[PDB]
């Protein structure tokens, strides 16, 4: 039926305050609103997560520390480095309220899916997949993805997490490494020195979870066609072997041409094809954002993907709105790939796909 859109002005305002992505939440929503897509969705106000809800995954020691440094923005606390707070995750004033708000939003989205309110629930300000139970990491203070999966499992026996962010979805993968009830699949850049450093194709999970983690290491320069070939190949095999009851999909836009990280060379059309493939499964699906550091392009991407969810074709002209001047010099929705090389060699991609296919054979 009609997708749920997690939103409130207070929520966007809170999400806007994260210093690694200032105002991004407003730009994303403003563009969605400019295309009048919110009128085709069920707008649901996010609840803030309670301490107990956050503690379903995060340790009390970590949560108390976060709450502590959040009071005065103590960035010089003796225990902060142990808790992952530093350059990537500064201890800013109010950061605990921020994290509670995002955790709550993804939980709210998960609850809408449990209650059958919708088949698709969207939280574009979520997807903070790097955070660990006791450690901030990679701009992530709280792992809303894990919290959403833990909520969904109350109802859905097998959950497939698909992570299309530029970076390895390490926090979610590690969390579920030892279970066969949640399968994680991450496509990401994998190169020595590139954050977080994990997620080779040989990383497949541990114990009862062995073969229930799937990683696709990709090199700089990949474009829409090759990425979709890889993603379709993997997801086809995964759907067949795992038979998920629900899906959580992280769609970090740091893969998109024009991102300052300048690694992949994707456009939202290519990501959209991957999304369409997952949507045709007709399963309860929780849609999350993630990275994305060209703010206008991230808005372009997630707006386009929202159009994909709604089955609509959007006008190529960006409508005038609050942030219109950020859309130059072209002022169009489409993104043009950069003219740099694809460093992915066909033989290596094939080897990766062979290896994964062999791994999934054990899944039954």
């Amino acid at each position: 039926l009609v997708p749920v859109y997690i939103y409130s002005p207070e929520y966007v305002s809170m999400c806007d305050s994260l210093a690694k992505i200032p105002k991004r939440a407003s730009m994303v929503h403003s563009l969605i609103e400019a295309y009048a897509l919110h009128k085709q969705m069920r707008i649901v106000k996010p609840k803030v997560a309670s301490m107990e809800e956050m503690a379903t995954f995060h340790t009390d020691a970590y949560l108390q520390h976060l709450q502590k440094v959040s009071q005065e923005g103590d960035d010089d606390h003796p225990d902060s480095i142990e808790y992952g707070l530093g350059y990537d995750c500064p201890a800013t004033e109010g950061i605990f309220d921020y994290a509670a708000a995002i955790g709550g939003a993804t939980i709210t989205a998960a609850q809408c899916l449990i209650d059958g309110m919708c088949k698709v629930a969207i939280n574009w300000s979520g997807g903070w997949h790097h955070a660990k139970k006791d450690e901030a990491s990679g701009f992530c203070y709280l792992n809303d993805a894990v919290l959403g999966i833990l909520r969904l499992r109350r109802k859905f026996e097998r959950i497939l997490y698909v992570d299309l962010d530029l970076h390895h979805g390490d926090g979610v993968e590690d969390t579920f490494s030892f279970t066969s009830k949640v399968m994680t699949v991450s496509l990401h850049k994998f190169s020595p020195g590139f954050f977080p450093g994990t997620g080779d194709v040989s990383d497949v999970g541990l114990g009862k979870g062995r073969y229930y983690s799937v990683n696709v290491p990709i090199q700089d320069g990949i474009q829409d066609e090759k990425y979709y070939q890889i993603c379709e190949s993997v997801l086809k095999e995964v759907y067949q072997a795992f038979n998920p009851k629900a899906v959580v999909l992280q769609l970090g836009a740091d893969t998109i041409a024009g991102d300052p990280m300048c690694s992949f060379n994707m456009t939202p059309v290519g990501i959209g094809k991957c999304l369409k493939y997952i949507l045709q499964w007709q399963l309860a699906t929780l849609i999350l954002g993630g990275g994305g550091f060209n703010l206008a392009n991230t808005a372009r991407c997630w707006t386009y993907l929202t159009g994909v969810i709604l089955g609509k074709t959007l006008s190529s002209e960006i409508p005038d709105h609050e942030f219109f001047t950020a859309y130059g010099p072209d002022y169009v929705l489409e993104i043009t790939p950069s003219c740099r090389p694809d460093r992915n060699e066909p033989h290596r991609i094939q080897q990766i796909l062979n290896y994964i296919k062999g791994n999934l054979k054990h899944v039954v």
Partner: peptide, 4 residues
């Protein structure tokens, strides 16, 4: 620990 890498930096992001």
């Amino acid at each position: 620990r890498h930096k992001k």
